[PDB]
Ligand SMILES: *C(=O)[C@H](C[C@@H]1CCNC1=O)NC(=O)[C@H](CC(C)C)NC(=O)OC[C@@H]1C[C@H]1c1cccc(Cl)c1
Protein backbone atom coordinates (compact mmCIF):
# COMPACT_ATOMS: atom_id res chain seq x y z
CA UNK A 91 0.00 0.00 0.00
CA UNK A 92 1.30 3.42 -1.06
CA UNK A 93 0.18 6.94 -0.25
CA UNK A 94 -2.34 8.64 -2.56
CA UNK A 95 -0.31 10.38 -5.25
CA UNK A 96 -2.67 13.14 -6.42
CA UNK A 97 -0.81 15.88 -4.57
CA UNK A 98 2.48 14.79 -6.15
CA UNK A 99 1.03 14.23 -9.64
CA UNK A 100 0.34 17.95 -9.96
CA UNK A 101 4.02 18.78 -9.47
CA UNK A 102 5.70 16.56 -12.10
CA UNK A 103 7.11 18.30 -15.18
CA UNK A 104 9.18 17.28 -18.20
CA UNK A 105 12.71 18.69 -18.31
CA UNK A 106 14.91 18.62 -21.42
CA UNK A 107 18.58 19.42 -22.03
CA UNK A 108 20.07 18.59 -25.40
CA UNK A 109 18.54 15.20 -26.13
CA UNK A 110 18.38 14.05 -22.50
CA UNK A 111 14.88 14.18 -21.00
CA UNK A 112 13.95 13.36 -17.41
CA UNK A 113 11.39 14.39 -14.80
CA UNK A 114 11.35 17.43 -12.55
CA UNK A 115 9.52 18.52 -9.40
CA UNK A 116 7.83 21.92 -9.83
CA UNK A 117 7.25 23.47 -6.40
CA UNK A 118 6.48 27.17 -5.96
CA UNK A 119 8.66 28.85 -8.61
CA UNK A 120 11.41 26.20 -8.72
CA UNK A 121 11.88 22.99 -10.72
CA UNK A 122 14.15 20.39 -9.11
CA UNK A 123 15.71 17.64 -11.22
CA UNK A 124 18.89 15.54 -11.36
CA UNK A 125 21.88 17.50 -12.62
CA UNK A 126 23.06 14.77 -15.01
CA UNK A 127 20.36 15.99 -17.41
CA UNK A 128 23.01 18.42 -18.68
CA UNK A 129 25.16 15.44 -19.66
CA UNK A 130 25.68 13.87 -23.07
CA UNK A 131 26.60 10.25 -23.78
CA UNK A 132 30.31 11.00 -23.42
CA UNK A 133 29.97 13.25 -20.38
CA UNK A 134 28.28 10.53 -18.33
CA UNK A 135 31.46 8.51 -17.76
CA UNK A 136 33.22 11.19 -15.69
CA UNK A 137 31.52 14.59 -15.99
CA UNK A 138 32.87 17.85 -14.58
CA UNK A 139 29.47 19.32 -13.73
CA UNK A 140 30.98 22.74 -13.04
CA UNK A 141 32.47 23.11 -16.52
CA UNK A 142 29.42 21.44 -18.09
CA UNK A 143 26.79 23.64 -16.43
CA UNK A 144 28.96 26.68 -17.16
CA UNK A 145 28.45 26.00 -20.88
CA UNK A 146 24.67 26.04 -20.37
CA UNK A 147 22.17 28.91 -20.30
CA UNK A 148 18.55 29.27 -19.22
CA UNK A 149 17.26 28.96 -22.79
CA UNK A 150 18.96 25.54 -23.04
CA UNK A 151 16.41 24.16 -20.53
CA UNK A 152 12.99 23.25 -21.96
CA UNK A 153 10.52 22.59 -19.14
CA UNK A 154 7.18 21.28 -20.44
CA UNK A 155 4.28 21.02 -17.97
CA UNK A 156 1.34 19.17 -19.49
CA UNK A 157 2.58 24.23 -21.53
CA UNK A 158 6.25 25.24 -21.85
CA UNK A 159 7.63 27.10 -18.84
CA UNK A 160 10.40 29.68 -19.27
CA UNK A 161 13.55 29.52 -17.14
CA UNK A 162 14.98 32.72 -15.67
CA UNK A 163 17.54 31.40 -13.20
CA UNK A 164 19.49 28.20 -12.61
CA UNK A 165 21.91 26.95 -9.96
CA UNK A 166 23.38 23.64 -8.81
CA UNK A 167 22.86 22.40 -5.24
CA UNK A 168 24.97 19.26 -4.69
CA UNK A 169 23.78 16.60 -7.18
CA UNK A 170 20.44 18.31 -7.91
CA UNK A 171 19.80 21.20 -10.30
CA UNK A 172 17.36 24.00 -9.49
CA UNK A 173 15.47 25.90 -12.19
CA UNK A 174 13.91 29.21 -11.22
CA UNK A 175 10.87 29.67 -13.46
CA UNK A 176 8.58 32.61 -14.18
CA UNK A 177 5.37 30.82 -13.16
CA UNK A 178 4.64 29.41 -9.71
CA UNK A 179 2.91 26.03 -9.64
CA UNK A 180 -0.77 26.59 -8.71
CA UNK A 181 -1.01 22.92 -7.65
CA UNK A 182 1.80 23.40 -5.11
CA UNK A 183 0.86 21.41 -1.98
CA UNK A 184 2.04 22.06 1.54
CA UNK A 185 5.47 20.44 1.49
CA UNK A 186 8.83 20.15 3.23
CA UNK A 187 12.17 18.56 2.37
CA UNK A 188 13.31 15.86 4.80
CA UNK A 189 16.24 13.44 4.83
CA UNK A 190 14.96 10.06 5.99
CA UNK A 191 16.90 7.46 7.97
CA UNK A 192 17.56 3.84 6.94
CA UNK A 193 14.65 1.53 7.64
CA UNK A 194 12.02 4.20 6.98
CA UNK A 195 9.63 3.72 4.06
CA UNK A 196 8.10 6.06 1.50
CA UNK A 197 6.00 6.03 -1.67
CA UNK A 198 7.56 6.51 -5.11
CA UNK A 199 5.66 8.09 -8.00
CA UNK A 200 7.34 6.56 -11.06
CA UNK A 201 7.25 9.02 -13.96
CA UNK A 202 8.47 9.09 -17.56
CA UNK A 203 8.61 12.16 -19.80
CA UNK A 204 7.01 14.11 -16.96
CA UNK A 205 3.86 11.95 -16.84
CA UNK A 206 2.96 9.79 -13.82
CA UNK A 207 2.92 6.09 -14.71
CA UNK A 208 2.65 4.31 -11.35
CA UNK A 209 3.04 4.48 -7.59
CA UNK A 210 4.54 1.99 -5.14
CA UNK A 211 6.05 1.78 -1.66
CA UNK A 212 9.76 1.35 -0.92
CA UNK A 213 12.17 1.28 2.00
CA UNK A 214 15.51 3.02 2.55
CA UNK A 215 17.69 -0.07 2.93
CA UNK A 216 20.33 -0.07 5.69
CA UNK A 217 23.01 0.27 2.99
CA UNK A 218 21.21 3.41 1.70
CA UNK A 219 19.94 1.78 -1.50
CA UNK A 220 16.34 1.02 -2.46
CA UNK A 221 14.93 -2.05 -4.23
CA UNK A 222 12.85 -0.19 -6.78
CA UNK A 223 11.54 -0.63 -10.33
CA UNK A 224 13.07 2.15 -12.43
CA UNK A 225 13.61 2.27 -16.19
CA UNK A 226 15.37 4.79 -18.41
CA UNK A 227 13.78 8.22 -18.15
CA UNK A 228 12.53 7.49 -14.64
CA UNK A 229 15.21 9.83 -13.26
CA UNK A 230 13.68 12.77 -11.43
CA UNK A 231 10.90 10.67 -9.93
CA UNK A 232 10.52 11.46 -6.24
CA UNK A 233 9.75 9.52 -3.08
CA UNK A 234 7.48 11.07 -0.50
CA UNK A 235 5.32 10.70 2.59
CA UNK A 236 2.07 12.47 3.47
CA UNK A 237 1.60 13.57 7.09
CA UNK A 238 -1.70 15.42 7.63
CA UNK A 239 -1.97 17.42 4.36
CA UNK A 240 1.80 18.00 4.11
CA UNK A 241 3.92 16.21 1.49
CA UNK A 242 7.35 15.34 2.92
CA UNK A 243 9.62 14.86 -0.09
CA UNK A 244 12.55 12.63 0.82
CA UNK A 245 13.97 11.08 -2.37
CA UNK A 246 14.83 11.82 -5.99
CA UNK A 247 15.96 9.00 -8.26
CA UNK A 248 19.28 9.18 -10.08
CA UNK A 249 20.80 5.85 -11.07
CA UNK A 250 20.85 2.06 -10.91
CA UNK A 251 23.68 0.02 -9.41
CA UNK A 252 25.47 -3.03 -10.86
CA UNK A 253 23.34 -5.27 -8.63
CA UNK A 254 20.05 -3.81 -9.88
CA UNK A 255 19.13 -1.82 -6.75
CA UNK A 256 18.77 1.95 -6.98
CA UNK A 257 20.40 5.08 -5.58
CA UNK A 258 19.44 8.72 -5.37
CA UNK A 259 19.45 11.92 -3.36
CA UNK A 260 17.32 13.89 -0.97
CA UNK A 261 15.74 17.06 -2.36
CA UNK A 262 18.88 19.03 -1.44
CA UNK A 263 21.05 16.97 -3.79
CA UNK A 264 22.97 14.91 -1.22
CA UNK A 265 23.12 11.24 -2.16
CA UNK A 266 21.89 8.62 0.27
CA UNK A 267 24.91 6.41 0.88
CA UNK A 268 28.34 6.30 -0.75
CA UNK A 269 27.28 7.11 -4.29
CA UNK A 270 28.20 9.73 -6.89
CA UNK A 271 26.30 10.68 -10.05
CA UNK A 272 28.70 9.30 -12.65
CA UNK A 273 28.36 6.22 -14.85
CA UNK A 274 30.85 4.00 -13.05
CA UNK A 275 30.57 0.73 -11.17
CA UNK A 276 29.77 1.47 -7.52
CA UNK A 277 29.28 -1.12 -4.78
CA UNK A 278 26.89 -0.86 -1.84
CA UNK A 279 27.62 -2.21 1.60
CA UNK A 280 26.36 -5.62 2.61
CA UNK A 281 22.63 -5.20 3.14
CA UNK A 282 20.90 -6.03 6.42
CA UNK A 283 17.32 -6.96 7.29
CA UNK A 284 15.33 -4.28 9.13
CA UNK A 285 14.45 -6.32 12.21
CA UNK A 286 11.93 -3.91 13.74
CA UNK A 287 10.06 -3.88 10.43
CA UNK A 288 9.82 -7.68 10.35
CA UNK A 289 8.36 -7.59 13.86
CA UNK A 290 5.77 -5.00 12.83
CA UNK A 291 5.01 -7.30 9.89
CA UNK A 292 4.50 -10.30 12.19
CA UNK A 293 2.19 -8.08 14.24
CA UNK A 294 0.17 -7.13 11.15
CA UNK A 295 -0.08 -10.88 10.54
CA UNK A 296 -1.42 -11.63 14.03
CA UNK A 297 -3.93 -8.80 13.57
CA UNK A 298 -5.03 -10.51 10.33
CA UNK A 299 -5.64 -14.00 11.72
CA UNK A 300 -2.19 -15.44 10.95
CA UNK A 301 -1.05 -17.07 14.20
CA UNK A 302 0.62 -20.39 13.30
CA UNK A 303 4.04 -18.86 14.04
CA UNK A 304 3.42 -17.90 17.68
CA UNK A 305 5.19 -19.88 20.39
CA UNK A 306 9.10 -19.75 24.32
CA UNK A 307 10.73 -16.37 24.99
CA UNK A 308 14.15 -14.71 25.12
CA UNK A 309 16.08 -11.69 26.38
CA UNK A 310 16.99 -8.69 24.25
CA UNK A 311 20.68 -9.63 24.36
CA UNK A 312 19.81 -13.24 23.52
CA UNK A 313 17.69 -12.57 20.42
CA UNK A 314 20.22 -10.04 19.13
CA UNK A 315 22.88 -12.72 19.55
CA UNK A 316 20.78 -14.87 17.22
CA UNK A 317 19.93 -12.00 14.87
CA UNK A 318 23.51 -10.86 14.25
CA UNK A 319 24.15 -14.23 12.58
CA UNK A 320 21.36 -13.79 9.98
CA UNK A 321 22.38 -10.24 8.99
CA UNK A 322 19.48 -8.84 11.02
CA UNK A 323 19.79 -5.35 12.47
CA UNK A 324 20.24 -5.53 16.27
CA UNK A 325 17.00 -4.82 18.12
CA UNK A 326 17.47 -1.99 20.61
CA UNK A 327 15.11 -0.85 23.36
CA UNK A 328 13.96 2.07 21.21
CA UNK A 329 12.76 -0.56 18.74
CA UNK A 330 10.82 -2.25 21.54
CA UNK A 331 9.23 1.05 22.56
CA UNK A 332 8.35 1.76 18.93
CA UNK A 333 6.46 -1.56 18.77
CA UNK A 334 4.67 -0.77 22.04
CA UNK A 335 1.33 0.29 20.57
CA UNK A 336 1.21 -2.83 18.40
CA UNK A 337 1.89 -4.95 21.49
CA UNK A 338 -0.92 -3.19 23.37
CA UNK A 339 -3.37 -3.57 20.49
CA UNK A 340 -2.60 -7.29 20.10
CA UNK A 341 -1.59 -8.35 23.61
CA UNK A 342 1.68 -10.05 22.65
CA UNK A 343 4.74 -9.02 24.64
CA UNK A 344 7.34 -7.68 22.22
CA UNK A 345 9.99 -10.15 23.35
CA UNK A 346 7.59 -13.07 22.88
CA UNK A 347 7.14 -12.00 19.26
CA UNK A 348 10.94 -11.83 19.03
CA UNK A 349 11.16 -15.42 20.25
CA UNK A 350 8.68 -16.48 17.57
CA UNK A 351 10.84 -14.67 15.00
CA UNK A 352 14.01 -16.38 16.25
CA UNK A 353 12.16 -19.67 15.70
CA UNK A 354 11.49 -18.68 12.08
CA UNK A 355 15.09 -17.62 11.45
CA UNK A 356 16.36 -20.93 12.85
CA UNK A 357 13.72 -23.50 11.88
CA UNK A 358 12.42 -21.63 8.83
CA UNK A 359 8.80 -21.20 7.79
CA UNK A 360 8.48 -24.82 6.58
CA UNK A 361 6.46 -23.90 3.50
CA UNK A 362 3.62 -22.15 5.41
CA UNK A 363 3.01 -18.48 4.38
CA UNK A 364 2.56 -15.44 6.65
CA UNK A 365 0.32 -12.73 5.19
CA UNK A 366 0.52 -14.61 1.90
CA UNK A 367 4.31 -14.33 1.67
CA UNK A 368 6.93 -17.09 1.75
CA UNK A 369 9.65 -14.73 3.02
CA UNK A 370 10.03 -12.46 6.06
CA UNK A 371 9.11 -8.95 4.90
CA UNK A 372 11.06 -5.99 6.28
CA UNK A 373 9.69 -3.00 4.33
CA UNK A 374 6.76 -2.28 6.67
CA UNK A 375 7.44 0.04 9.59
CA UNK A 376 5.45 -0.05 12.84
CA UNK A 377 4.02 3.37 11.96
CA UNK A 378 2.97 1.91 8.60
CA UNK A 379 1.10 -1.01 10.17
CA UNK A 380 -0.58 1.42 12.57
CA UNK A 381 -1.84 3.45 9.61
CA UNK A 382 -3.42 0.20 8.32
CA UNK A 383 -4.84 -1.22 11.55
CA UNK B 384 2.77 -0.88 -8.85
CA UNK B 385 -0.63 0.82 -8.96
CA UNK B 386 -2.06 3.53 -11.19
CA UNK B 387 -1.73 7.17 -10.10
CA UNK B 388 -4.78 7.93 -7.98
CA UNK B 389 -5.10 11.72 -8.30
CA UNK B 390 -8.01 11.53 -10.74
CA UNK B 391 -9.90 9.22 -8.38
CA UNK B 392 -9.01 11.13 -5.20
CA UNK B 393 -11.06 14.10 -6.40
CA UNK B 394 -14.20 11.97 -6.59
CA UNK B 395 -14.33 10.41 -3.10
CA UNK B 396 -17.00 11.73 -0.72
CA UNK B 397 -18.27 10.82 2.75
CA UNK B 398 -21.81 9.39 2.86
CA UNK B 399 -23.82 9.03 6.07
CA UNK B 400 -27.12 7.31 6.88
CA UNK B 401 -28.16 7.03 10.50
CA UNK B 402 -24.88 6.17 12.21
CA UNK B 403 -23.44 4.18 9.29
CA UNK B 404 -20.76 6.05 7.34
CA UNK B 405 -18.98 4.81 4.22
CA UNK B 406 -17.42 6.21 1.05
CA UNK B 407 -19.08 7.34 -2.15
CA UNK B 408 -18.01 8.10 -5.72
CA UNK B 409 -19.13 11.56 -6.86
CA UNK B 410 -19.23 11.66 -10.67
CA UNK B 411 -21.08 14.38 -12.57
CA UNK B 412 -24.20 14.98 -10.44
CA UNK B 413 -24.43 11.48 -8.92
CA UNK B 414 -22.92 9.86 -5.82
CA UNK B 415 -22.58 6.07 -5.98
CA UNK B 416 -22.18 4.05 -2.78
CA UNK B 417 -23.10 0.62 -1.38
CA UNK B 418 -26.77 0.34 -0.50
CA UNK B 419 -26.16 -1.30 2.89
CA UNK B 420 -25.39 2.19 4.21
CA UNK B 421 -29.14 2.44 4.87
CA UNK B 422 -28.85 -0.55 7.21
CA UNK B 423 -28.70 -0.62 11.00
CA UNK B 424 -27.04 -3.29 13.15
CA UNK B 425 -30.18 -5.44 13.11
CA UNK B 426 -30.98 -4.91 9.42
CA UNK B 427 -27.61 -6.28 8.31
CA UNK B 428 -28.48 -9.92 9.03
CA UNK B 429 -31.23 -10.17 6.40
CA UNK B 430 -32.33 -6.73 5.14
CA UNK B 431 -35.28 -6.08 2.84
CA UNK B 432 -33.68 -3.18 1.00
CA UNK B 433 -36.96 -2.25 -0.69
CA UNK B 434 -38.82 -1.72 2.59
CA UNK B 435 -35.73 -0.15 4.18
CA UNK B 436 -35.04 2.40 1.44
CA UNK B 437 -38.77 3.16 1.31
CA UNK B 438 -38.52 4.46 4.89
CA UNK B 439 -35.72 6.83 3.82
CA UNK B 440 -35.82 10.32 2.30
CA UNK B 441 -33.28 12.58 0.62
CA UNK B 442 -32.68 14.57 3.81
CA UNK B 443 -31.65 11.35 5.58
CA UNK B 444 -28.50 11.24 3.41
CA UNK B 445 -25.62 13.48 4.53
CA UNK B 446 -22.95 13.67 1.82
CA UNK B 447 -19.85 15.56 2.98
CA UNK B 448 -17.20 16.41 0.38
CA UNK B 449 -14.05 17.77 2.02
CA UNK B 450 -18.67 20.94 2.17
CA UNK B 451 -22.05 19.24 2.65
CA UNK B 452 -23.84 18.38 -0.59
CA UNK B 453 -27.65 18.33 -0.73
CA UNK B 454 -29.50 15.32 -2.13
CA UNK B 455 -32.47 15.86 -4.45
CA UNK B 456 -33.06 12.37 -5.83
CA UNK B 457 -32.23 8.79 -4.88
CA UNK B 458 -32.74 5.37 -6.46
CA UNK B 459 -31.41 1.83 -6.05
CA UNK B 460 -29.64 0.06 -8.93
CA UNK B 461 -28.99 -3.57 -7.94
CA UNK B 462 -26.72 -3.54 -4.85
CA UNK B 463 -25.56 0.07 -5.34
CA UNK B 464 -27.40 3.24 -4.32
CA UNK B 465 -27.38 6.37 -6.49
CA UNK B 466 -27.71 9.86 -5.02
CA UNK B 467 -28.65 12.67 -7.38
CA UNK B 468 -27.09 15.84 -5.97
CA UNK B 469 -27.52 19.52 -6.76
CA UNK B 470 -23.83 20.15 -7.51
CA UNK B 471 -21.83 18.45 -10.25
CA UNK B 472 -18.29 17.42 -9.32
CA UNK B 473 -15.86 19.90 -10.94
CA UNK B 474 -13.06 17.32 -10.58
CA UNK B 475 -15.03 14.79 -12.65
CA UNK B 476 -12.53 12.98 -14.91
CA UNK B 477 -13.29 11.29 -18.20
CA UNK B 478 -14.69 7.96 -17.02
CA UNK B 479 -16.66 4.88 -17.98
CA UNK B 480 -18.16 1.94 -16.09
CA UNK B 481 -16.80 -1.46 -17.14
CA UNK B 482 -17.30 -4.99 -15.80
CA UNK B 483 -13.92 -6.73 -15.80
CA UNK B 484 -13.27 -10.44 -16.34
CA UNK B 485 -11.49 -12.81 -13.94
CA UNK B 486 -7.71 -12.60 -14.17
CA UNK B 487 -7.70 -8.88 -14.96
CA UNK B 488 -6.09 -6.49 -12.48
CA UNK B 489 -6.95 -3.01 -11.24
CA UNK B 490 -5.89 -0.43 -8.66
CA UNK B 491 -7.86 0.11 -5.45
CA UNK B 492 -7.99 3.49 -3.69
CA UNK B 493 -8.65 2.52 -0.07
CA UNK B 494 -10.68 5.24 1.66
CA UNK B 495 -12.16 5.81 5.11
CA UNK B 496 -14.67 8.52 6.04
CA UNK B 497 -14.38 9.78 2.46
CA UNK B 498 -10.63 10.47 2.68
CA UNK B 499 -8.07 8.56 0.58
CA UNK B 500 -5.69 6.55 2.77
CA UNK B 501 -3.78 4.34 0.33
CA UNK B 502 -3.60 2.78 -3.12
CA UNK B 503 -2.65 -0.74 -4.19
CA UNK B 504 -3.07 -3.19 -7.07
CA UNK B 505 -5.35 -6.23 -7.01
CA UNK B 506 -6.62 -8.98 -9.29
CA UNK B 507 -10.11 -10.32 -9.93
CA UNK B 508 -9.56 -13.90 -8.80
CA UNK B 509 -11.05 -16.70 -10.92
CA UNK B 510 -13.64 -17.28 -8.16
CA UNK B 511 -14.64 -13.58 -8.44
CA UNK B 512 -13.11 -12.57 -5.09
CA UNK B 513 -10.14 -10.28 -4.48
CA UNK B 514 -7.33 -10.64 -1.93
CA UNK B 515 -7.46 -7.10 -0.61
CA UNK B 516 -6.75 -5.17 2.60
CA UNK B 517 -10.05 -3.63 3.72
CA UNK B 518 -11.10 -2.52 7.20
CA UNK B 519 -14.41 -1.25 8.55
CA UNK B 520 -15.52 1.91 6.80
CA UNK B 521 -13.59 0.97 3.66
CA UNK B 522 -16.89 0.15 1.93
CA UNK B 523 -17.48 2.38 -1.07
CA UNK B 524 -13.82 2.34 -2.09
CA UNK B 525 -13.51 1.71 -5.82
CA UNK B 526 -11.17 -0.19 -8.10
CA UNK B 527 -10.16 1.37 -11.39
CA UNK B 528 -7.88 1.42 -14.41
CA UNK B 529 -6.57 4.41 -16.37
CA UNK B 530 -6.41 4.07 -20.16
CA UNK B 531 -5.18 7.27 -21.86
CA UNK B 532 -6.83 9.95 -19.66
CA UNK B 533 -9.99 7.89 -19.06
CA UNK B 534 -10.73 6.30 -15.68
CA UNK B 535 -12.41 2.91 -16.13
CA UNK B 536 -14.19 2.20 -12.85
CA UNK B 537 -14.68 -1.54 -12.40
CA UNK B 538 -15.16 -2.28 -8.69
CA UNK B 539 -16.84 -1.04 -5.52
CA UNK B 540 -16.11 -2.76 -2.22
CA UNK B 541 -18.92 -4.18 -0.11
CA UNK B 542 -17.94 -6.97 2.27
CA UNK B 543 -15.40 -9.49 3.56
CA UNK B 544 -15.86 -13.25 3.38
CA UNK B 545 -15.33 -15.86 6.12
CA UNK B 546 -11.94 -16.70 4.59
CA UNK B 547 -10.72 -13.09 4.68
CA UNK B 548 -10.92 -12.37 0.94
CA UNK B 549 -13.22 -9.63 -0.32
CA UNK B 550 -16.29 -9.24 -2.52
CA UNK B 551 -18.00 -6.34 -4.22
CA UNK B 552 -19.85 -5.06 -7.26
CA UNK B 553 -19.26 -3.26 -10.50
CA UNK B 554 -20.46 0.34 -10.66
CA UNK B 555 -23.92 -0.84 -11.76
CA UNK B 556 -24.47 -2.74 -8.50
CA UNK B 557 -24.08 -6.31 -9.79
CA UNK B 558 -21.87 -8.41 -7.54
CA UNK B 559 -18.84 -10.16 -8.96
CA UNK B 560 -19.46 -13.83 -8.24
CA UNK B 561 -22.12 -15.60 -6.19
CA UNK B 562 -22.45 -13.05 -3.40
CA UNK B 563 -25.27 -11.02 -1.86
CA UNK B 564 -25.01 -7.95 0.38
CA UNK B 565 -26.22 -9.47 3.64
CA UNK B 566 -24.24 -10.39 6.75
CA UNK B 567 -24.28 -14.16 6.32
CA UNK B 568 -21.60 -16.77 5.77
CA UNK B 569 -20.95 -17.12 2.04
CA UNK B 570 -18.44 -19.47 0.42
CA UNK B 571 -16.43 -18.80 -2.72
CA UNK B 572 -15.53 -21.44 -5.26
CA UNK B 573 -12.17 -23.16 -5.09
CA UNK B 574 -9.67 -20.58 -6.31
CA UNK B 575 -7.35 -21.18 -9.27
CA UNK B 576 -4.00 -19.69 -10.26
CA UNK B 577 -4.08 -17.33 -13.25
CA UNK B 578 -1.60 -19.19 -15.45
CA UNK B 579 -1.15 -16.53 -18.13
CA UNK B 580 -0.32 -14.02 -15.40
CA UNK B 581 2.39 -16.27 -13.94
CA UNK B 582 3.92 -16.54 -17.41
CA UNK B 583 3.91 -12.76 -17.83
CA UNK B 584 5.56 -12.62 -14.40
CA UNK B 585 8.29 -15.05 -15.46
CA UNK B 586 8.78 -12.85 -18.52
CA UNK B 587 9.14 -9.73 -16.36
CA UNK B 588 11.75 -11.73 -14.43
CA UNK B 589 13.75 -12.61 -17.55
CA UNK B 590 13.61 -8.95 -18.57
CA UNK B 591 15.06 -8.09 -15.14
CA UNK B 592 18.05 -10.44 -15.20
CA UNK B 593 16.40 -13.39 -13.43
CA UNK B 594 17.16 -16.42 -15.61
CA UNK B 595 18.04 -19.32 -13.30
CA UNK B 596 14.65 -20.92 -14.02
CA UNK B 597 15.02 -21.24 -17.80
CA UNK B 598 15.47 -24.72 -19.27
CA UNK B 599 13.15 -28.73 -22.31
CA UNK B 600 9.80 -27.91 -23.94
CA UNK B 601 6.23 -29.19 -24.16
CA UNK B 602 3.00 -29.03 -26.15
CA UNK B 603 0.00 -26.92 -25.18
CA UNK B 604 -2.03 -30.04 -24.37
CA UNK B 605 0.90 -31.45 -22.38
CA UNK B 606 1.51 -28.44 -20.12
CA UNK B 607 -2.22 -28.03 -19.50
CA UNK B 608 -2.29 -31.70 -18.47
CA UNK B 609 0.32 -30.79 -15.86
CA UNK B 610 -1.35 -27.50 -14.92
CA UNK B 611 -4.80 -28.95 -14.23
CA UNK B 612 -3.26 -30.90 -11.33
CA UNK B 613 -1.93 -27.79 -9.55
CA UNK B 614 -5.21 -25.83 -9.82
CA UNK B 615 -3.74 -23.74 -12.64
CA UNK B 616 -6.08 -22.26 -15.23
CA UNK B 617 -5.70 -24.10 -18.56
CA UNK B 618 -3.55 -22.16 -21.02
CA UNK B 619 -5.41 -21.59 -24.28
CA UNK B 620 -4.04 -20.31 -27.59
CA UNK B 621 -5.49 -16.86 -26.89
CA UNK B 622 -3.24 -16.82 -23.82
CA UNK B 623 -0.27 -17.64 -26.05
CA UNK B 624 -1.18 -14.85 -28.47
CA UNK B 625 -1.56 -12.44 -25.55
CA UNK B 626 2.00 -13.23 -24.45
CA UNK B 627 3.27 -12.75 -28.01
CA UNK B 628 4.76 -9.28 -27.57
CA UNK B 629 6.61 -10.39 -24.43
CA UNK B 630 8.01 -13.36 -26.37
CA UNK B 631 9.15 -11.05 -29.17
CA UNK B 632 10.75 -8.57 -26.77
CA UNK B 633 12.63 -11.32 -24.91
CA UNK B 634 13.14 -13.99 -27.57
CA UNK B 635 11.76 -16.92 -25.55
CA UNK B 636 9.16 -19.05 -27.29
CA UNK B 637 6.00 -19.03 -25.18
CA UNK B 638 5.91 -22.82 -24.88
CA UNK B 639 9.54 -22.90 -23.73
CA UNK B 640 8.60 -20.56 -20.88
CA UNK B 641 5.69 -22.91 -20.16
CA UNK B 642 8.13 -25.82 -19.90
CA UNK B 643 10.23 -23.83 -17.43
CA UNK B 644 7.05 -23.16 -15.43
CA UNK B 645 6.10 -26.84 -15.44
CA UNK B 646 9.56 -27.51 -13.99
CA UNK B 647 8.83 -25.07 -11.16
CA UNK B 648 5.41 -26.57 -10.43
CA UNK B 649 6.92 -30.07 -10.28
CA UNK B 650 10.42 -29.58 -8.83
CA UNK B 651 9.63 -26.37 -6.94
CA UNK B 652 11.81 -23.27 -6.70
CA UNK B 653 14.29 -24.92 -4.29
CA UNK B 654 14.67 -21.83 -2.12
CA UNK B 655 15.84 -19.51 -4.96
CA UNK B 656 13.66 -16.36 -5.48
CA UNK B 657 12.30 -14.97 -8.77
CA UNK B 658 11.88 -11.18 -8.79
CA UNK B 659 12.49 -11.30 -5.05
CA UNK B 660 9.52 -13.58 -4.36
CA UNK B 661 9.49 -17.12 -3.00
CA UNK B 662 6.12 -17.92 -4.63
CA UNK B 663 4.79 -17.86 -8.20
CA UNK B 664 2.92 -14.57 -8.59
CA UNK B 665 -0.27 -14.49 -10.67
CA UNK B 666 -1.58 -10.93 -10.20
CA UNK B 667 0.42 -9.38 -13.06
CA UNK B 668 -1.19 -9.44 -16.50
CA UNK B 669 0.82 -9.37 -19.75
CA UNK B 670 -0.58 -5.90 -20.44
CA UNK B 671 0.65 -4.87 -16.98
CA UNK B 672 4.21 -6.07 -17.61
CA UNK B 673 4.16 -4.29 -20.97
CA UNK B 674 3.26 -1.03 -19.21
CA UNK B 675 6.39 -1.57 -17.06
CA UNK B 676 8.87 -2.74 -19.70
C1 LIG C 1 17.78 7.99 -15.52
O1 LIG C 1 16.47 7.70 -15.95
C2 LIG C 1 18.53 6.67 -15.39
C3 LIG C 1 17.71 5.64 -14.59
C4 LIG C 1 18.39 4.22 -14.61
C5 LIG C 1 18.45 3.64 -16.18
C6 LIG C 1 18.50 2.36 -16.10
N1 LIG C 1 17.69 2.02 -14.81
C7 LIG C 1 17.70 3.35 -13.94
O2 LIG C 1 17.20 3.51 -12.88
N2 LIG C 1 19.79 6.92 -14.69
C8 LIG C 1 21.09 6.96 -15.40
O3 LIG C 1 21.14 6.77 -16.57
C9 LIG C 1 22.36 7.24 -14.60
C10 LIG C 1 23.00 8.58 -14.99
C11 LIG C 1 24.42 8.72 -14.38
C12 LIG C 1 24.95 10.17 -14.55
C13 LIG C 1 24.47 8.31 -12.89
N3 LIG C 1 23.28 6.14 -14.83
C14 LIG C 1 22.81 4.75 -14.63
O4 LIG C 1 21.83 4.54 -14.01
O5 LIG C 1 23.56 3.68 -15.16
C15 LIG C 1 24.13 2.93 -14.10
C16 LIG C 1 24.72 1.61 -14.66
C17 LIG C 1 24.65 0.42 -13.71
C18 LIG C 1 25.98 1.15 -13.91
C19 LIG C 1 27.24 0.25 -14.10
C20 LIG C 1 28.48 0.86 -14.29
C21 LIG C 1 29.62 0.07 -14.46
C22 LIG C 1 29.53 -1.32 -14.43
C23 LIG C 1 28.29 -1.93 -14.24
CL1 LIG C 1 28.17 -3.72 -14.21
C24 LIG C 1 27.14 -1.14 -14.07
Ligand SMILES: *C(=O)[C@H](C[C@@H]1CCNC1=O)NC(=O)[C@H](CC(C)C)NC(=O)OC[C@@H]1C[C@H]1c1cccc(Cl)c1
Pocket residue numbers: 405419422427517518519520521522541542543544545549563564565566567568569
Ligand atom coordinates in the same frame (compact mmCIF):
# COMPACT_ATOMS: atom_id res chain seq x y z
C1 LIG D 1 -17.86 -1.90 5.08
O1 LIG D 1 -16.79 -1.05 5.38
C2 LIG D 1 -17.50 -3.30 5.57
C3 LIG D 1 -16.10 -3.71 5.10
C4 LIG D 1 -15.64 -5.06 5.75
C5 LIG D 1 -15.53 -4.89 7.41
C6 LIG D 1 -14.70 -5.77 7.83
N1 LIG D 1 -13.68 -5.93 6.65
C7 LIG D 1 -14.45 -5.41 5.36
O2 LIG D 1 -14.03 -5.37 4.25
N2 LIG D 1 -18.47 -4.25 5.03
C8 LIG D 1 -19.55 -4.83 5.87
O3 LIG D 1 -19.64 -4.55 7.02
C9 LIG D 1 -20.54 -5.81 5.22
C10 LIG D 1 -21.96 -5.23 5.17
C11 LIG D 1 -23.00 -6.32 4.78
C12 LIG D 1 -24.38 -5.69 4.47
C13 LIG D 1 -22.53 -7.18 3.58
N3 LIG D 1 -20.50 -7.04 5.98
C14 LIG D 1 -19.21 -7.69 6.25
O4 LIG D 1 -18.26 -7.40 5.61
O5 LIG D 1 -19.10 -8.68 7.25
C15 LIG D 1 -18.85 -9.93 6.65
C16 LIG D 1 -18.48 -10.97 7.74
C17 LIG D 1 -17.48 -12.04 7.31
C18 LIG D 1 -18.98 -12.39 7.42
C19 LIG D 1 -19.31 -13.74 8.12
C20 LIG D 1 -20.65 -14.12 8.26
C21 LIG D 1 -20.97 -15.32 8.88
C22 LIG D 1 -19.97 -16.16 9.37
C23 LIG D 1 -18.63 -15.79 9.23
CL1 LIG D 1 -17.34 -16.86 9.85
C24 LIG D 1 -18.30 -14.58 8.60
